[PDB]
């Protein structure tokens, strides 16, 4: 029966294709990824277990070598492939990291858009993904990106929901939480931060970088701004401070000044995250290293550059033989990169048309992980030919909102405003004007009400009046207004709707994404453990006479040969003929054409 | 096991088409399956012959006032319009209906002619099986064959003991009435077949082939006396019936008034008239013959009548209805059987010629009806489609060059070969017989001029014979020269080549057509009793998801559904997925493309 | 401008195809064009000079006394009407007339006009039936030209005022018709007189036809017996006929009946007898030869290439059967064959319009469908989705006949039994249903019309009960339809068509408007747009010109245009396509719409 359900998925996708891939570019008809051939050395996970998060932070600070986080399994494909990377390809390589690169600080492999996209577009459970990475890499810290009060969502959730999710995240295998607020509002971070400390995990509290500290004509986001936030985050209980440069705006000279001041303002270790949209982010990471930074993020070469992180292999190689040499074997970095390259070839459907570095990024400030999603939304609205006016709008809308930190979900709001402006030919002067009528997007109404928080100088008065159209704003923390969710009764609703008990993890999914989770859980009961399928089989099914080996449970491999596919019958059904371990099986599926 | 072989055939033809039908016109898709009408049976001419014997039966025919009818639909009808491609399945299934509905019929012409070899070579079916099914369906009617005298059912001369052997088997197989003819109207060559049919106590109906025009005084060679003498000669040779075989449909009404009055005066034997409707007036000649006392006439069912076939049975009967000689056939039943044949005919669209209607051109060329369409294609084969009227002029020229000879299988084919060559190479009667013009004749023209088909009245033309042979000719009977074949030896040969014993019938097939029989036997061993398949299935296999009912045998229907067809694999094989009586079956056949 | 107009036609059909041919089977690709047989001396006087000399009355006497059987060739009319939906073009028909004239000068006549040709020429072939007649008259000045004329219906399907019927006949004679075969669909002699008199006023031959139906040798069907026919022959003589025809439209006359019928007709009247039949049965030649044996004066046949099945039986083979006999027609068989080969090559161009008829059918003695309707009714059936139940329709046609009183079925009465049969199958009605009290039925317009009396009267009248139910309160009439019709105002209606066309018209065109106002109007506007497309050879008319194809078009007697299709543009932003022609060496560009 589990095997029968799988055959049903393979039939369906063989006959009808997959909605996300069928109408997009295909992989070359030509070679599956090969896991390189190799107990594992204890690493940062064991140390953290030994020391506890606070002392583990001190250890990082005192460590001379720069510490490396690999982002390939989350930000890398979030930024380059619409986050469509699958568990099968991610989990299959964890053991290789574990054996080959046991010195790594952490694998960023969770949170961001992965939680949402796994269930919705990939038909898979993010919690199972985490558990398979945990088992494959028992010696490395597993790191997630946590959106503070938004969790893994796009809306501010109630305090008890936020706390419940963090508890399950830590139970599921998360050792290191990078937590941020999209307005750098420390008050909105305290609930998350406290909950991370209560699970006795690493709270790496992030400060989002924007502007240019070395440009005295933008004083709002100056050095003092960052050094103060660092100090405040320490008082709030951070184990580590992160600079999250989501748009890749930090320049080398600025890094040199920033990381020095930061390490003088707080004793906590500093972790630096950036994107390579400019084509020079590697120079910034290196400058940060020269200036004492304790840890940096990079992506494997094959999923690096442009809107992703800068090249991990080339950064390591730049540091090779130096005092701060991170002690990672370049031959193994290459082998792993060659794996990800062959992996990436399978996701041709989701490539963007980004051709290289663009200094334009310093003008628009679009986050790396948003840039391509937003280019799609603009195509969607017939704007493809006017992309450069969109980027100009985004920068204009930013100034109109008071010049703000733009990261998920504040970035999406500027996005929605920018798109509207271009579509309807509206200038800043018109959007605010009293004599021009404007129906603002639900996201802009929401933010201007105070649903995402408060910037330094509040929100601009006049823009806020016209937007709310009678509504009274609020300036307090959103979670302080929200009602503690009835958890026992919220559980009953989902358990009644699935006609079965659920696990604590599944309930957490439901709290974050009730509709996505529900739809996903009903799909799972139909199609089975489709995450065990190789990626070409998942997206395109099986060719006539093609043989597939799939491991259903740990013990047992299923041998599936697609022998033949019928025409559509009078009742609208197609019959796919299979061999399962040398036994014949027919499976009927609907012709969705 | 016969089932597995049937599935092998159905798969083989579904995947590759039938070679005879693949590249030709297709029946209309909507297509109504032919429907056998709904109805012991009245004793008829079979029981009469069984009571009276052949001589007494001939007397009975003679004394009968009503004109007796032979239906030719089963044989000459489709030989002449559909290149003899009609299948046992469609033929046998209506036999019982003839038996119940038209019990007064003299006979069913259903065997001999081109059917014998065409069934095996082109339809993968045994002609003896066909005969026995008609016998079992029509136990009350005479079954009639066409026998080519010394040629048996071949195109060549066979030893006397072989001719004797084949007639014996044909009698065992169910043939009651033997129409026997010689291609030059030479009685000496007819003497053995006639003795063999008498020795087996069946009806010897000795035919005289009609050619020329008795009422034109500028053509004396084929005057009335020629035919009256040949009638008396064939009576002295022991005929029970005399036939006038007007192979090319050259007999005109006025000539019929004279010929048949004179014939019945010359002999006490009954007379049987066979013609073809190429001129579009042969029904007039038939009606004139009736009005002049002829005892029996041939017609074909409406739906397979006209043009190069026999004239319309239904309309003839209808013209006689109520007259002194009315044949006592129910017109409503002729109509119903004709509606059956119409639907059957539609299945054989692949084999329809382009013949538009009547042609008085027939009086010039004298091509037999049953050859006309064969030769038009043979000329198409040699790229002559565009000069068909020159080929027709060449056939008439050749005829005169050979001395104004009787044209019919196989002498007709000889003249055909000569005409085709003459046109190909732009050659006249003057060129073909010129002293200084080096030709290379067909292997059939030499053969004829040698003496292999026998002797015409005046012999062969001296000059045209020398240039053709180069080799002394013989004037004697061909069978007097052919050594008596060792039957016990030739039977051990075929039984070794097939590694199994054969029936007496099968050995007679071998004697007539060693190559075609050998190939058919082998194909039968591979594909099974394919003759039980309905005609669409036999020529085109099964549509995707199509359900066939086949009666592998009288006590057993099989239910066969084509559920799917695989792609061609790396061995070049194709797998067809059947459901046979509810059970999955997998048949591999080569991709012949 | 005439040339420019032709180019316009050629561009249009090249780009868009012809509506009649586009989606139908295509002729073979290579195709030898029809070759007109070479003749070079004058033409022997024939029946045309005889009628001019004697007048019709003395001509009929000459026919009667003439020992040899006389022949009418119907290939130019009934032949293709029956086999090719009457789609045969003037170009192919006129080109052989001269050959008939030089090579078969003993023919009684050429049946070359009337029937469906008048209508179809204009509507489906964009040509003028008068131009056709005139071109045939020019090419065969020694043979009688013969038409089928439908009596009260002219060359139409409706009934017309007397003065219009007369006016048409007058133009037909001016246009070149010598021999009018005139018939009434119910054999109602009263309905023929106006026609018969018009023909006599024009001093042409009036061949009054008796349509044959049933079986005179079947006493279980007395209504249509021997004397029914001999009495009509007598009344037609009294009414001024020069010749009596037996018009066996369905090919139902059998050989033994012909033997009795023609011996009797010759005894009953002093007029010559002329026999027309069809070969649907596959034995009509036998009936023709029986009629000759029994003394008939003339018979109709079709050239071999267009003979058989629903057409006439085979001219060449019939002539061959008579060769050397007492009544030998004196027609060279070799020339019959050469002319048949020409028609064969002609016919290959019309593959689009071939029916799927396989051969003879004794079924014809059941349904009694006319030969020149059989195929047309078979399309109607297909149209209504009834291809698969054709034999049901045929059974219903025979059922509908007996319900109507067992009538004569021929244009336009046959058209009405068709419509009734077609309705009966669709809606699964028996005869008992159609005449039922408690079953409401919406009859065809044509059937309401017939039972009212717009087609005239059969001998025993219409069935009372069935007429009540069909009319639904409408009072019927039994008088001659034309006696109730207001005399058309010919001066005023001439002004109407001349106003609509913004030009004066000819007497002939006017006669066409009177018969078919709508069709003629449409054809006259089409001609103003497209010019004299009748002069194009047939492949070019139906399929235009292939890429790079050179065509020689005889735009008139003197003058030949050389036309090459050099290129065809894509469809432009206004939905137009430009065809680049060379015309006599000069570049020309014609824009036509993309009709896709
Ligand atoms: N368009 C949706 C996203 C849905 C895409 C993937 N669908 C699922 O995960 C549901 C599971 C069942 C769908 C399978 S996939 C291929 C086979 N082919 C089909 O068309 N359906 C089945 C969104 O925007 O939310
Ligand atoms: C068909 C729908 C697929 C939508 C996702 C594509 S993937 C690449 C392009 N880049 C994005 O971020 N979204 C679109
Ligand atoms: N080309 C041959 C005529 C042979 C045609 C029919 N063949 C036989 O009777 C032999 C056995 C059947 C072969 C089957 S038929 C359909 C399936 N499709 C194929 O292409 N071969 C197999 C001649 O000229 O003699
Ligand atoms: N469908 C009409 C019959 C009309 C058929 C012939 N058409 C005409 O006679 C109109 C004159 C010009 C039309 C030409 S033909 C080819 C070119 N292609 C076209 O589609 N139109 C022009 C009916 O049933 O009444
Ligand atoms: N659209 C069209 O196909 C027009 C064709 C109308 C005449 C056809 S031709 C042969 C069949 N026989 C007929 O008399 N009418 C139809
Ligand atoms: Cl959701
Ligand atoms: Cl052989
Ligand atoms: Cl009209
Ligand atoms: Mg350090
Ligand atoms: Mg007798
Ligand atoms: Mg006479
Ligand atoms: Zn990032
Ligand atoms: Zn024959
Ligand atoms: Zn007619």
- Domain at B1-30+529-593, CATH class: alpha beta
Q: Which of A11, A13, A17, A19 to mutate to test the pocket of ligand 1 (most atoms within 8 A of CB)?
A: A19
The C-alpha of C361 sits at a distance from chain B's nearest C-alpha, in angstroms, of 5
Contacts of B524 (CB under 8 A, 6+ apart): B124, B126
The rounded distance, in Å, linking the Cα atoms of A32 and B580 is: 39
The rounded distance, in Å, linking the Cα atoms of A281 and A310 is: 6
The domain made up of A63-350 has a fold known as TIM Barrel (3.20.20)
Resolution value, angstrom units: 2.4
CA A226 to chain centre: 24
The rounded distance, in Å, linking the Cα atoms of C470 and C480 is: 20
Q: Describe chain B by its helix, strand, coil percentages, rounded to 5.
A: 50, 15, 40
Query: Nearest 5 degrees, angle CA B178-CA B180-CA B183?
Result: 160
The domain made up of A351-469 has a fold known as Cyclin A; domain 1 (1.10.472)
- Residue A299 has, within 13 A of its CA and on its CB side, a CA count of 27
- Kind and range of the H or E run holding C143: none
The rounded distance, in Å, linking the Cα atoms of C559 and C556 is: 5
Q: Which of A212, A241, A238 is nearest to A227 (CA)?
A: A241
Closest C-alpha residue for ligand 2 atom 6: A350
Which residues lie across from C182 on neighbouring strands? C149, C208
Residue of B nearest to A565 (CA): B564
Output the CA–CA distances (angstroms, integers) from residue C276 to B540, C111, C250, in the order listed.
46, 11, 10
- SS3 of residue B245 by DSSP: strand
Cβ atoms C176, C133 nearer than 8 A: yes
The neighbours of chain B, by the rule of 3 or more Cβ pairs under 8 Å, are A, C
The rounded distance, in Å, linking the Cα atoms of C305 and A32 is: 70
- Kind and range of the H or E run holding C76: none
What the block records as the tokens of A394 is: 């985004």
Cβ atoms A197, A234 nearer than 8 A: no
Count of all residues that appear for chain A in the document: 593
Same topology, domains B1-30+529-593 and B352-470? Answer is no
Cβ atoms C277, C284 nearer than 8 A: yes
- Kind and range of the H or E run holding B47: helix B45-52
| DSSP string for A410-477 | HHHHHHHHHHHHHHTT--HHHHH-TTS-----HHHHHHHHTSS---TT-S-HHHHHHHHTTPPP--S-
* Sign of the dihedral defined by the CA atoms of residues B370, B375, B380, B386, in that order: negative
The rounded distance, in Å, linking the Cα atoms of C282 and B334 is: 15
The rounded distance, in Å, linking the Cα atoms of A590 and A583 is: 23
The C-alpha of B213 sits at a distance from chain C's nearest C-alpha, in angstroms, of 11
Cβ atoms B11, B335 nearer than 8 A: no
- Kind and range of the H or E run holding C124: helix C117-125
Distance C353 CA to ligand 5 centre (A): 6
- Domain at B64-351, CATH class: alpha beta
- SS3 of residue B282 by DSSP: helix
Contacts of A379 (CB under 8 A, 6+ apart): none
Q: Which residues of B touch A573 (CB under 8 A)?
A: none
Inter-axis angle of helices B127-137 and B504-512, to 10 degrees? 130
What the block records as the tokens of C518 is: 């709508």
In chain B, domain spans:
1-30+529-593, 64-351, 352-470, 485-528
> What are the phi and psi torsion angles at B89 (to 5°)?
-50, -45
**In terms of CATH architecture, what is B485-528?**
Orthogonal Bundle (1.10)
Cβ atoms C16, C592 nearer than 8 A: yes
Distance B586 CA to ligand 6 centre (A): 47
The rounded distance, in Å, linking the Cα atoms of B308 and B282 is: 10
The residues placing their C-beta within 5 Å of ligand 6, an ion, are A 513, 515-516
What would you report as the CA-atom Rg of chain B, rounded to the nearest whole angstrom?
Answer: 24
Catalytic residue among C12, C78, C184, C300: C78
Cβ atoms B452, B411 nearer than 8 A: no
Q: Describe chain A by its helix, strand, coil percentages, rounded to 5.
A: 50, 15, 40
Q: Residue-wise over B538-563: b if at least 16 C-beta within 10 A, else e? A: bbbbbeebeebebebeeeeebebebb
The rounded distance, in Å, linking the Cα atoms of A197 and C414 is: 101
Interface test with B, best of A563, A572, A584 (most B CBs within 10 A): A563
Cβ atoms A198, A222 nearer than 8 A: no
Q: Provide the H-helix boundaries in C247-283.
A: 255-268
Contacts of B206 (CB under 8 A, 6+ apart): B180, B181, B190, B194, B234, B237, B239, B241, B242, B243
The rounded distance, in Å, linking the Cα atoms of C306 and C288 is: 17
Q: Which residues of B touch A567 (CB under 8 A)?
A: 544-545, 564
**In terms of CATH architecture, what is C354-472?**
Orthogonal Bundle (1.10)
Q: Which of B104, B96, B1, B119 is nearest to B39 (CA)?
A: B96
The rounded distance, in Å, linking the Cα atoms of B584 and A564 is: 13
Q: Is the CB of A329 under 6 A from ligand 2?
A: no
Touch between chain C and chain A: 3 or more Cβ pairs under 8 Å: no
The rounded distance, in Å, linking the Cα atoms of A418 and C217 is: 98
The rounded distance, in Å, linking the Cα atoms of B449 and B569 is: 56
Contacts of C175 (CB under 8 A, 6+ apart): C130, C133, C134, C137, C508
The rounded distance, in Å, linking the Cα atoms of A301 and A312 is: 6
What the block records as the tokens of C552 is: 């020689």
* Experiment type: X-ray
Q: Which of A398, A263, A369, A359 is nearest to A307 (CA)?
A: A369
Between chain A and chain B, how many beta carbons pairs sit less than 8 Å apart?
Answer: 35
Contact assignment for A564 to B569 by CB distance below 8 Å: no
Q: Which of A169, A79, A74, A139 is nearest to A112 (CA)?
A: A74
Q: Which residues of B touch C305 (CB under 8 A)?
A: 356-357
| Locus of tokens 């240019």 | A212
Cβ atoms B220, B404 nearer than 8 A: no
Which residues lie across from B586 on neighbouring strands? B577
CATH of domain C488-531: 1.10.10.60
Contacts of A439 (CB under 8 A, 6+ apart): none
Cβ atoms B420, B391 nearer than 8 A: yes
Closest C-alpha residue for ligand 5 atom 1: C20
- SS3 of residue A212 by DSSP: coil
Contact assignment for B357 to C218 by CB distance below 8 Å: no
What the block records as the tokens of B100 is: 């119940």
What the block records as the tokens of A289 is: 């290293």
Touch between chain B and chain C: 3 or more Cβ pairs under 8 Å: yes
User: Pairing mode, if any, of strands B296-299 and A583-590?
Assistant: unpaired
The C-alpha of A563 sits at a distance from chain B's nearest C-alpha, in angstroms, of 6
| Locus of tokens 């007639």 | B167
CATH of domain B352-470: 1.10.472.90
Q: Which of B564, B566, B586 sits opposite A575 (nearest CB)?
A: B564
Count Cβ atoms below 10 Å from residue A323 Cβ, excluding itself: 10
Residues in A whose CB is inside 8 Å of some CB of B read: 543-545, 563-567, 569, 575, 577, 584, 586
The rounded distance, in Å, linking the Cα atoms of A440 and A417 is: 8
Query: Nearest 5 degrees, angle CA A415-CA A420-CA A422?
Result: 95
The rounded distance, in Å, linking the Cα atoms of C267 and B107 is: 44
The rounded distance, in Å, linking the Cα atoms of C580 and C566 is: 5
Nearest ligand to the C-alpha atom of residue A533: 1
Count of all residues that appear for chain C in the document: 596
Cβ atoms B206, B494 nearer than 8 A: no
Q: Provide the H-helix boundaries in C349-489.
A: 364-367, 371-383, 390-403, 413-426, 431-434, 445-452, 464-471
What the block records as the tokens of C533 is: 């497309």
Q: Which of B566, B469, B538, B571 is nearest to B10 (CA)?
A: B538
Contact assignment for B566 to A545 by CB distance below 8 Å: yes
Q: Is C406 a catalytic residue?
A: no
- Residue C330 has, within 13 A of its CA and on its CB side, a CA count of 12
Count Cβ atoms below 10 Å from residue C56 Cβ, excluding itself: 23
Q: Is the CB of C287 under 6 A from ligand 4?
A: no
What the block records as the tokens of C127 is: 């040509």
Q: Where are the beta strands (DSSP E) in B228-386?
A: 241-245, 271-274, 296-299
Inter-axis angle of helices A514-527 and A487-498, to 10 degrees? 30
| DSSP string for C177-229 | --EEEE--TT--GGGTHHHHHHHHHTT-EEEEEEE--S-TT-TT-GGG-HHHH
Q: Is the CB of A120 under 6 A from ligand 1?
A: yes
Closest C-alpha residue for ligand 2 atom 8: A350
Phi/psi-derived region of residue A253, left when phi > 0, alpha when psi is between -120 and 50, beta in every other case = alpha
Contacts of C445 (CB under 8 A, 6+ apart): none
Q: Which residues of A touch B585 (CB under 8 A)?
A: none
CATH of domain C1-30+532-596: 3.10.600.10
Nearest ligand to the C-alpha atom of residue B530: 3
The rounded distance, in Å, linking the Cα atoms of A366 and A248 is: 9
Distance B76 CA to ligand 3 centre (A): 24
Starting from the edge strand earliest in sequence, which strands make up the sheet with C576-583, in order?
A: C550-554, C560-568, C576-583, C586-593
Contacts of C166 (CB under 8 A, 6+ apart): C194, C198, C201
The rounded distance, in Å, linking the Cα atoms of C509 and C167 is: 12
Cβ atoms B122, B162 nearer than 8 A: no
Q: Which residues in chain C have their C atom more than 2.5 Å from the N of the next written residue, marking a break after them?
A: 39
Q: Is B274 annotated as a binding residue?
A: yes
Cβ atoms C215, C222 nearer than 8 A: no
What the block records as the tokens of C272 is: 């010559």
Q: Is A244 a catalytic residue?
A: yes
The rounded distance, in Å, linking the Cα atoms of C195 and C177 is: 14
Domain C66-353 listed as CATH 3.20.20.70: yes
* Sign of the dihedral defined by the CA atoms of residues B510, B513, B516, B520, in that order: negative
Q: Which of B393, B179, B185 is nearest to B271 (CA)?
A: B179
Is cis: bond before C412, omega within 30 of 0? yes
Closest C-alpha residue for ligand 4 atom 1: C19
Query: Nearest 5 degrees, angle CA A61-CA A64-CA A69?
Result: 70
The rounded distance, in Å, linking the Cα atoms of A65 and A57 is: 14
In eight-state DSSP terms, residue C4 is H
User: Pairing mode, if any, of strands C550-554 and C298-301?
Assistant: unpaired
Residue of B nearest to C337 (CA): B361
Which residues lie across from A271 on neighbouring strands? A242, A295
Closest C-alpha residue for ligand 5 atom 15: C376
What the block records as the tokens of B463 is: 């000059």
Cβ atoms C191, C201 nearer than 8 A: no
Q: Is the CB of A372 under 6 A from ligand 2?
A: yes
Closest C-alpha residue for ligand 5 atom 3: C20
Q: Where are the beta strands (DSSP E) in A77-140?
A: 106-111
* Sign of the dihedral defined by the CA atoms of residues B284, B286, B287, B291, in that order: positive
The rounded distance, in Å, linking the Cα atoms of B110 and C311 is: 32
The rounded distance, in Å, linking the Cα atoms of A550 and A567 is: 27
Contacts by C37-42, CB closer than 8 A, 24 or more apart:
C37/C99, C37/C103, C37/C338, C37/C339, C37/C342, C39/C98, C39/C99, C39/C102, C39/C103
The rounded distance, in Å, linking the Cα atoms of A39 and A62 is: 28
The rounded distance, in Å, linking the Cα atoms of C249 and C115 is: 12
Q: Which of A549, A546, A540 is nearest to A561 (CA)?
A: A546
Q: Describe chain C by its helix, strand, coil percentages, rounded to 5.
A: 50, 15, 40
Task: Give helix then strand counts, H and E, for chain A.
Answer: 27, 12
The rounded distance, in Å, linking the Cα atoms of A453 and A475 is: 7
Interface test with A, best of B544, B564, B587 (most A CBs within 10 A): B564
The rounded distance, in Å, linking the Cα atoms of A182 and C546 is: 70
The rounded distance, in Å, linking the Cα atoms of C79 and C97 is: 15
> What are the phi and psi torsion angles at B528 (to 5°)?
80, -160
Q: Is A408 a catalytic residue?
A: yes
Cβ atoms A208, A232 nearer than 8 A: no
- SS3 of residue C302 by DSSP: strand
Output the CA–CA distances (angstroms, integers) from residue A294 to A56, A223, A291, C55, in the order listed.
12, 19, 9, 128
Which residues lie across from A547 on neighbouring strands? A561
Inter-axis angle of helices C117-125 and C517-530, to 10 degrees? 40
| DSSP string for A475-527 | -S-HHHHS----HHHHHHHHHHHHTS---HHHHHHHHH-HHHHHHHHHHHHHH
The residues placing their C-beta within 5 Å of ligand 13, an ion, are B 76
């Amino acid at each position: 029966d589990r095997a029968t359900k799988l055959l049903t998925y393979l039939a369906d996708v063989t006959v009808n294709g997959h909605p996300e891939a069928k109408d997009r570019p295909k992989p070359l008809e030509n070679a599956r990824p090969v896991v390189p051939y190799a107990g594992v050395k204890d690493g940062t996970k064991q140390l953290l277990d030994t020391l506890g998060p606070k002392k583990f932070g001190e250890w990082m600070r005192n460590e001379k070598r720069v510490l490396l986080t690999d982002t390939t399994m989350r930000d890398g494909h979030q930024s380059l492939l619409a986050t469509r990377m699958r568990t099968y390809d991610i989990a299959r390589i964890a053991g290789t990291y574990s054996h080959a690169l046991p010195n790594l600080l952490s694998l960023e492999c969770w949170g961001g858009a992965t939680f949402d996209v796994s269930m919705r577009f990939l038909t898979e459970d993010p919690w199972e993904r985490l558990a398979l990475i945990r088992e494959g890499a028992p010696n490395l810290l597993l790191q997630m990106l946590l959106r503070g009060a938004n969790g893994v969502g796009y809306t501010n959730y109630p305090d008890n929901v936020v706390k419940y999710f963090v508890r399950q995240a830590a139970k599921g295998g998360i050792d290191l939480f990078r937590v941020f607020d999209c307005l750098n509002w420390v008050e909105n971070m305290r609930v998350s931060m406290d909950a991370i400390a209560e699970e006795n995990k690493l709270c790496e509290a992030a400060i989002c970088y924007t502007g240019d500290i070395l440009n005295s004509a933008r004083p709002k986001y100056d050095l003092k701004y960052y050094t103060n936030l660092a100090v405040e985050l320490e008082k709030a209980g951070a184990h580590i401070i992160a600079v999250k440069d989501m748009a890749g705006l930090l320049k080398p000279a600025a890094a040199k000044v920033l990381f020095k001041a930061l390490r003088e303002a707080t004793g906590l270790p500093i972790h630096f995250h950036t994107h390579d949209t400019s084509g020079i982010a590697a120079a910034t990471v290196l400058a940060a290293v020269e200036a004492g930074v304790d840890a940096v993020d990079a992506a494997m070469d094959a999923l690096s550059g442009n809107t992703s992180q800068p090249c991990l292999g080339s950064i390591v190689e730049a540091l090779s033989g130096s005092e701060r040499d991170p002690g990672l074997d370049p031959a193994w970095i290459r082998r792993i990169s060659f794996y990800w390259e062959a992996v990436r070839n399978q996701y041709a459907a989701f490539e963007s048309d980004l051709k290289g570095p663009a200094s334009e990024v310093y003008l628009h400030e679009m986050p790396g992980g948003q840039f391509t999603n937003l280019k799609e939304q603009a195509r969607s609205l017939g704007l493809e030919t006017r992309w450069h006016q969109v980027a100009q709008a985004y920068a204009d809308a930013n100034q109109m909102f008071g010049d703000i930190v733009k990261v998920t979900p504040s970035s999406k709001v500027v996005g929605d405003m920018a798109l509207m402006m271009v579509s309807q030919d509206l200038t800043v002067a018109d959007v605010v004007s009293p004599d021009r009528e404007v129906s603002f997007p639900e996201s802009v109404v929401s933010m201007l009400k105070g649903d995402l928080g408060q910037p330094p100088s509040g929100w601009p008065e006049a823009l806020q009046k016209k937007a709310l159209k009678g509504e009274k704003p609020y300036t307090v923390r959103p979670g302080s207004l929200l009602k503690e969710a009835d958890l026992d009764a919220e559980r009953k609703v989902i358990e009644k709707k699935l006609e079965r008990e659920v696990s604590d993890f599944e309930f957490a999914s439901y709290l974050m994404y009730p509709k996505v989770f529900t739809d996903f859980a009903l799909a799972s009961d139909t199609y089975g453990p489709v995450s065990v399928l190789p990626t070409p089989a998942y997206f395109y099914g099986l060719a006539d006479g093609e043989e597939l080996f799939a491991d259903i449970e740990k013990g047992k491999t299923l041998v599936i040969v697609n022998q033949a596919v019928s025409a559509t019958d009078s009742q609208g059904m197609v019959t796919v003929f299979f061999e399962l371990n040398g036994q014949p099986r027919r499976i009927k599926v609907p012709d969705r054409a």
